[PDB]
Amino acid sequence: GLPTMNTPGSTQFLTSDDFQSPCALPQFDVTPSMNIPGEVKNLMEIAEVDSVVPVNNVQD
Amino acid sequence: GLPTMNTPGSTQFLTSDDFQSPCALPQFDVTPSMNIPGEVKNLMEIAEVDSVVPVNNVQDTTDQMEMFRIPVTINAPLQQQVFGLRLQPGLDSVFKHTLLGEILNYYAHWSGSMKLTFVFCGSAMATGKFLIAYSPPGANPPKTRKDAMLGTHIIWDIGLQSSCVLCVPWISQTHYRLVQQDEYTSAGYVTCWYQTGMIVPPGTPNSSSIMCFASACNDFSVRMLRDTPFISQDNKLQ
Amino acid sequence: GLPTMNTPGSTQFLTSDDFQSPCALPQFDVTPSMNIPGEVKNLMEIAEVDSVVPVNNVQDTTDQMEMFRIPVTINAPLQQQVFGLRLQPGLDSVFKHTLLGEILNYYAHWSGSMKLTFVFCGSAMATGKFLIAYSPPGANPPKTRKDAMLGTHIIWDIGLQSSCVLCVPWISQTHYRLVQQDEYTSAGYVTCWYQTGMIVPPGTPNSSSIMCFASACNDFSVRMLRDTPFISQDNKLQ
Amino acid sequence: SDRVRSITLGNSTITTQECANVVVGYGRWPTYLRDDEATAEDQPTQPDVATCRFYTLDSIKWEKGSVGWWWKFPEALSDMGLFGQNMQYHYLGRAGYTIHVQCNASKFHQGCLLVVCVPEAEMGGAVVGQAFSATAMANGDKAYEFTSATQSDQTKVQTAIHNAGMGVGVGNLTIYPHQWINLRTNNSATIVMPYINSVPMDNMFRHYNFTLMVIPFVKLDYADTASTYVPITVTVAPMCAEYNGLRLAQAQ
Amino acid sequence: TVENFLGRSACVYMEEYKTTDNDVNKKFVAWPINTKQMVQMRRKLEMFTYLRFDMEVTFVITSRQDPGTTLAQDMPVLTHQIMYVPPGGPIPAKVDDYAWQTSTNPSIFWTEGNAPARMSIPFISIGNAYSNFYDGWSNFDQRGSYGYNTLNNLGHIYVRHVSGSSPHPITSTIRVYFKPKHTRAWVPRPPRLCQYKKAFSVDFTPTPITDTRKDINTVTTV
Amino acid sequence: TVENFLGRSACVYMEEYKTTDNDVNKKFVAWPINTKQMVQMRRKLEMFTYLRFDMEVTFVITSRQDPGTTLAQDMPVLTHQIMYVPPGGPIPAKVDDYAWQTSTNPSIFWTEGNAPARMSIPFISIGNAYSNFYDGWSNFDQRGSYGYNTLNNLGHIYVRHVSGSSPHPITSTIRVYFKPKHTRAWVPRPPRLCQYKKAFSVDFTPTPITDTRKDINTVTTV
């Protein structure tokens, strides 16, 4: 075998990791994509939309 | 050694994985290939072949072969119904065990058109016209020829050409339907009626049989491999 | 580290594997190569060499060397049989321990033609013609010269050229036969008969011996490496 | 018309005035074994006209209540002239065949037969687990018959027609080379079968390469005609027959 | 595609072998290679008459300590040997016999805790294609064995613990998976309808065409 | 091809060594390297008179806890040392002696649970080819040792547990595999017919040419 050496972090599960992994359903034929209106790409697109502010949020 | 780090999935055995592995018989000299007739490359090639549909799979069946014979008779009341079946190629008893239904049962999704071929098996002297229709889903199935004729249909005339093909088109809201069909994924009904009647000259039998074949069209495909509900065991064999 | 994922087979020791591994004697200076005569590169080179076949391996054998001597005599009844053997080069006792049979016994499949060379060892004054034949498998072996002559054969005449070669061709339904031959993989029989008779002048011995050699042809090959049934032990030696 | 057909092999000719087409194997015409596909090294015999000719088996009666018949090949031809003789003297044989099934009725009769050739038609016993002998499936040119009822006799094969003796659906036998004789249009069926096997040649007694099945899917029916039964006759011609491994003849 | 339909690993056999037992045969497995004992794989292959392919073999071996009154022990990791014996080779009669030397037969030595063992075998038939069915006999006489079993002579698989004798018995279970690859298939057949009864014969019990409904017009569920 | 025929790993030796024992010699192995003790490999090599090749060596080491009345312990993973001592080098007399320093001899330190240890050795003979047979003597006198054993001086292999003394004894078994590669062979000989009797001599007991049958025409089985 090719000589290797494991470094710290080996075997850990980091929630925000970004690795490849085997597919359990090899060769599964995905349903074709369809062009649905209203696609969102960034949450800032939502934050850029007006919403009514409850300014008069008083006690009584 | 080269620094590495194992990720999740490491050491697992996924049944549908696709990796390389060492060969236990290094340098084994394989027997030469031979060109045997009938090679299959896709299961859809099989589903595209006609098989006899047991349309007359009725309760009181004494003789099993009767299931393949659709009864047709002389002096039938005008506009009478010959048969009616619901389009669930993988679920309904009429289709589930045909070539097409068996292939469908190893998958969970299906899509495409179907060919229902009808062949008249009476004598050359008998005549008749039948209306064969397909009704896309709706709250109620057609109960009368008048109801049926509003949908997709063909009017079959008997002559030298004994067979007629009703091609049921893919009309659906979704691209695929489930093999284990449900209401959401409903496909409709196929019904047959006397257009005129089976007329006969003197000296010929009074009733005859019609047979129904089914196969997939070239726009048909299946998705999502799954095990079939049609085979099981309680013990290892032997 | 580089993210990796172990697949099945990881850590196993497959006897016929073919991987690299660290050298325990780093930088060891190997003794220079020398060109020794007789290098072998393929075991088939050995199987292609003639070895003496113990054709006369009969029950009452007193003297072991007699097994290599096929008896031939004067005034033999017309059309008499000299010998008969069944073609199972790796299984039959006549062949199993020859060079060819020994090589075959380290494999499970074989294919190709064979050379059976016969050498007459009587005096220069004796004469004779023999019919040597090969019968492809069938329900029954030839019992008479008339039966034998319908198959592949050669008519051997004795003269200055003492040896004759019967080349048994590869005639089979399958590309390969099993070394542990069975009925399905049957190869047939080789038989020998007096064509005329061994005639002799005055003052020469009344009987003589014929020897049989066997080797593989250039279309011969073996497949599927396996251990031989010919060697064993109950304890470590020493 | 194309309905007219004439076929000549050796010293025999077959003619038909009302036929369909001619079905050819899996689109494969019979052919002699090539040098690059052979194992057996001896020079083969190719008797030609003496063996590659039409042989007519014993006829049978199609009656209103008939259910179906089968014949196993090459066994069915084991007694036919030099074809049978060559089968006996040789360890190996190889051949394709032109099968011509004949059945004429009248414009007032009705009925429909499936004529199929099933390669490797391995069959199940009447009682599961119980072995049967060769005699339960083939014996010269004797026609064997299927039954409606399920078979009870353990010395027999499971003859219930709807499973064709193979445990499959009889209406799916159409994936094998076939033709239909619908009395209303045909009068015969012709299927040319090429040699199909997993080995280049094989012993002709020990292995039944394919089985011919003739099954009435639509029963024979007629009115007040004086004719009662309708005969069915099978005529078959070996094609490109070659044999290897000559030796003494096999007793049976 | 047939390559895709057949190309998934399927369990074709499983058996147990003990680390220590009084019965010699309980300590190793001897399996005559075949594809007829596990129902799922069998039905798939049997949809074709002839098949030609290379084979990927994966082994899943697991061990468990046998229950008992005294279980305290500290056994090091176990190593197994899987040896393939082509037809005619010497067969082991016990875990410690000479045959396990494998000077020529292929073997795999595998240690627990690691990725499952695996290797490829090429198309090894003596014929041009593997036969799923064989309507014939072994003898020219038309006697002897009948059926596909007469063509099955692929050899055996033998497996044992290497030097794993433990104070208290441990039971290992081996599962063997087959995944055909580089496949070709000829002359397709109707799928098996009747349940399988025997490993080495087509034998079955008559089963009806399909299930029934009340009448020829019934189309509702309730 | 000879490369292929000889190119499979074969077990050439095996021995046990304990983790703890009263007998010093039971705790380590000392093996005089040779290819004559395991029958299968021996027969193959001996089909040629002279051989020249590089050698791949793989070790399979397994451990088991010795049976006893009290077995409860919790021993950490074991590490083994395999040292090669060329002819003339200092030989270890016990598991803890200075010789195990290996400042110059090649050694392998291996820990259980991992892939089997392995390494390559080049063609190390002092001659131009290894001799499987030697019809001669050690002394010019035509006296002394007779046979191939006089040319065997490849050294020894020594193996011990590193600092593995356990409360209750554990027995490790080492198996050594040889796989010749980059092979050349000269002057082929008839295969060994008689069973082997000694590791260091050709010695045998007369064995008949082959097995017998009733008569010279018998061709049936029953």
The Cα–Cα gap between D161 and D146 comes to 5
Choose the closest CB to E118 out of B22, B37, B106: B22
- 179-198 in chain D: CB under 8 A from chain B: 182-185, 194, 196, 198
Q: For residue C47, what is the DSSP state?
A: H
User: Whats the size of chain C, residue-wise?
Assistant: 238
The alpha-carbon gap from A44 to the nearest alpha carbon of chain B, in Å, equals: 32
The Cα–Cα gap between C136 and E77 comes to 56
Asked if E163 and F14 touch (Cβ cutoff 8 Å), the reply is no
Choose the closest CB to F187 out of C19, C26, C37: C37
**Nearest to residue F64, comparing CAs of E79, B134, E17, D242?**
E79
The Cα–Cα gap between B89 and B103 comes to 10
Which of C14, C43, C174, C181 to mutate to test binding with chain E, by most E CBs within 10 Å of its CB? Answer: C14
**Nearest to residue F26, comparing CAs of F175, F176, F171?**
F171
The Cα–Cα gap between E32 and E86 comes to 10
3-state secondary structure of F126: coil
Count of D-E CB contacts under 8 Å: 73
Q: How many C-beta atoms lie closer than 10 Å to residue C144's C-beta?
A: 12
- 103-122 in chain C: CB under 8 A from chain E: 105-109
- Residue identified by tokens 């050496």 is A5
CB contact set of A14 (below 8 Å; sequence gap of 6+): none
H/E stretch holding C44: helix C44-47
The alpha-carbon gap from B14 to the nearest alpha carbon of chain D, in Å, equals: 34
The Cα–Cα gap between F222 and F218 comes to 10
H/E stretch holding C103: helix C99-104
Interface of A with C (CB under 8 A): 1, 4, 6-7, 9-10, 19-22
Q: Give the HSE-up count for residue B1: Cα atoms under 13 Å, Cβ half-sphere.
A: 13
Token code pair at residue E33: 């290679």
The Cα–Cα gap between C12 and E111 comes to 6
The Cα–Cα gap between D81 and F156 comes to 78
Could you list the residue range(s) of the whole structural domain that residue B84 is in?
A: 1-238
The alpha-carbon gap from B18 to the nearest alpha carbon of chain C, in Å, equals: 10
Token code pair at residue B137: 């889903």
- Residue identified by tokens 């010293």 is D11
Give chain D positions within 8 Å (CB) of E139: 206
Alpha carbon F60 to its chain's center: 12
H/E stretch holding E182: strand E170-188
- Go through D220-252 and write b for each residue having 16 or more CB atoms within 10 A of its CB, e for each that does not: bbbeeeeeeebebebbbbbbbbbbbbbbbbbee
Choose the closest CB to D198 out of E131, E191, E203: E131
The Cα–Cα gap between F160 and F175 comes to 13
The Cα–Cα gap between F193 and F48 comes to 15
At least 3 CB pairs under 8 A between chains F and C = yes
- Position C203: which residue type? G
Asked if C6 and E118 touch (Cβ cutoff 8 Å), the reply is no
Asked if E63 and E172 touch (Cβ cutoff 8 Å), the reply is yes
Minimum CA–CA partner of A11 in chain C = C3
Choose the closest CB to B9 out of A22, A25, A27: A22
Q: Hey, which residues does D180 pair with through a beta bridge? A: D114
Token code pair at residue B110: 């299906």
Q: Hey, which residues does E90 pair with through a beta bridge? A: none
- Position F73: which residue type? Q
**Nearest to residue E212, comparing CAs of D165, B66, D160?**
B66
3-state secondary structure of F208: coil
Q: Hey, which residues does C162 pair with through a beta bridge? A: none
The alpha-carbon gap from D16 to the nearest alpha carbon of chain C, in Å, equals: 37
Give chain B positions within 8 Å (CB) of C1: 2-6
The Cα–Cα gap between E136 and C184 comes to 10
Give chain B positions within 8 Å (CB) of D223: 202-205
Q: Cα dihedral sign for C138, C144, C147, C150?
A: positive
Q: Phi, psi at residue C143, to the nearest 5°?
A: -105, -10
Task: Determine contact: D199 vs chain C, CB below 8 A.
Answer: yes
Q: Hey, which residues does E118 pair with through a beta bridge? A: E58
Contact across the interface for E127 and D199, Cβ inside 8 Å:
yes
Token code pair at residue D163: 């499973």
CB contact set of E97 (below 8 Å; sequence gap of 6+): none
- Breaks in chain B, after residue numbers (C to N greater than 2.5 Å): none
**Nearest to residue E186, comparing CAs of E127, E130, E123, E124?**
E130
The alpha-carbon gap from E108 to the nearest alpha carbon of chain C, in Å, equals: 3
The Cα–Cα gap between C212 and C57 comes to 12
The Cα–Cα gap between E189 and E200 comes to 19
At least 3 CB pairs under 8 A between chains D and F = no
Asked if E141 and C139 touch (Cβ cutoff 8 Å), the reply is yes
**Nearest to residue E75, comparing CAs of C99, F159, F66?**
F66
3-state secondary structure of F203: coil
User: Whats the size of chain E, residue-wise?
Assistant: 222
- Residue identified by tokens 């059926």 is E147
- In chain E, what's the furthest Cα-to-Cα distance? 71
Give chain C positions within 8 Å (CB) of B5: 1-4
Token code pair at residue E14: 């499983």
3-state secondary structure of D245: strand
3-state secondary structure of D76: helix
Token code pair at residue C111: 């294919």
Token code pair at residue E179: 């995944």
Q: How many C-beta atoms lie closer than 10 Å to residue F103's C-beta?
A: 5
Token code pair at residue C58: 């009969």
Interface of D with E (CB under 8 A): 119-125, 128-129, 131, 134, 150, 158, 160, 162-163, 166-169, 172, 175, 196, 198-200, 203, 205-208, 250
Q: Which chains contact E through at least 3 pairs of Cβ atoms less than 8 Å apart? A: B, C, D, F
The Cα–Cα gap between B71 and E144 comes to 49
- Residue identified by tokens 């780093």 is C26
End-to-end C-alpha distance for chain F, whole angstroms = 39
Q: Using DSSP bridges, classify how beta strands C81-86 and C107-111 pair: parallel, antiparallel or unpaired.
A: unpaired
The Cα–Cα gap between A16 and E112 comes to 31
Task: Determine contact: D41 vs chain C, CB below 8 A.
Answer: yes
**Nearest to residue E210, comparing CAs of E187, E189, E190, E194?**
E194
Q: Hey, which residues does F172 pair with through a beta bridge? A: F17, F63
Q: Using DSSP bridges, classify how beta strands D5-9 and C221-225 pair: parallel, antiparallel or unpaired.
A: unpaired
CATH of the domain at B137: 2.60.120.20
Q: Give the HSE-up count for residue D23: Cα atoms under 13 Å, Cβ half-sphere.
A: 23
- Residue identified by tokens 């099955």 is E152
Choose the closest CB to B125 out of D26, D108, D171: D108
Token code pair at residue D110: 């009705």
The alpha-carbon gap from D109 to the nearest alpha carbon of chain B, in Å, equals: 7
- Breaks in chain D, after residue numbers (C to N greater than 2.5 Å): none
Q: For residue B77, what is the DSSP state?
A: P
The alpha-carbon gap from E167 to the nearest alpha carbon of chain C, in Å, equals: 25
3-state secondary structure of F11: strand
**Nearest to residue D54, comparing CAs of D209, D191, D239?**
D239
The Cα–Cα gap between C96 and C51 comes to 12
Q: Hey, which residues does C215 pair with through a beta bridge? A: C115
3-state secondary structure of F120: strand
The Cα–Cα gap between A44 and C169 comes to 83
Contact across the interface for B32 and E121, Cβ inside 8 Å:
no
Q: How many domains does chain B divide into?
A: 1
Asked if F47 and F204 touch (Cβ cutoff 8 Å), the reply is no
3-state secondary structure of E69: coil
Alpha carbon F130 to its chain's center: 16
- Residue identified by tokens 């050294």 is F155
Asked if C231 and C166 touch (Cβ cutoff 8 Å), the reply is no
The Cα–Cα gap between F2 and F186 comes to 10
The alpha-carbon gap from E42 to the nearest alpha carbon of chain D, in Å, equals: 15
> E strands, chain F, where?
10-18, 28-32, 48-65, 79-85, 107-111, 118-121, 130-131, 156-161, 170-188
The Cα–Cα gap between D244 and D39 comes to 11
Instruction: Classify residue B237 as exposed, middle or buried by CB count within 10 Å of its CB (0-12, 13-18, 19+).
Output: middle
Q: Which chains contact C through at least 3 pairs of Cβ atoms less than 8 Å apart? A: A, B, D, E, F
The Cα–Cα gap between C31 and F52 comes to 9
CA distances from F157 to C103, D110, F121 (A): 34, 91, 13
Asked if C192 and C128 touch (Cβ cutoff 8 Å), the reply is no
Give chain E positions within 8 Å (CB) of F175: 162
Which of C14, C15, C25 to mutate to test binding with chain F, by most F CBs within 10 Å of its CB? Answer: C25
Question: What is the number of helices (H) and of strands (E) in chain D?
Answer: 1, 13
The Cα–Cα gap between C92 and C85 comes to 9
Choose the closest CB to F113 out of E73, E113, E164: E113
H/E stretch holding E49: strand E48-65
Contact across the interface for B5 and C10, Cβ inside 8 Å:
no
